[PDB]
Amino acid sequence: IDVLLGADDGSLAFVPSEFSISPGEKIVFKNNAGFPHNIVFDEDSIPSGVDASKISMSEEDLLNAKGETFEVALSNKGEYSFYCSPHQGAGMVGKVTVN
Numbered sequence: 001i002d003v004l005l006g007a008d009d010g011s012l013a014f015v016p017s018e019f020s021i022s023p024g025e026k027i028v029f030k031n032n033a034g035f036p037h038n039i040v041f042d043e044d045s046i047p048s049g050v051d052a053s054k055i056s057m058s059e060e061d062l063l064n065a066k067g068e069t070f071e072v073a074l075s076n077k078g079e080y081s082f083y084c085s086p087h088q089g090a091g092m093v094g095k096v097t098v099n
Ligand SMILES: [Hg+2]
Pocket: 012, 035, 036, 037, 038, 084, 085, 086, 087, 092
């Protein structure tokens, strides 16, 4: 599935921000507008036993240019909350369900 980082009008959102995938499906996060952007999974809000470090950028890593991508595949079933660290407060958050 392709997820835009920043809407085409510059709003600080993941597009889409809520979505479902099957195990092993790759999410391609695409730097679009309003950067810098990153993707960080909340360790307290992902399935038990999942290593956040495997599926997240570092809070310190940033995508600074249009078209940079971050790709990840999830396999454990359940709900995954994620956010962009620099824009968390602006509401740039999302949740993926693996079902
Ligand atoms: Hg962001």
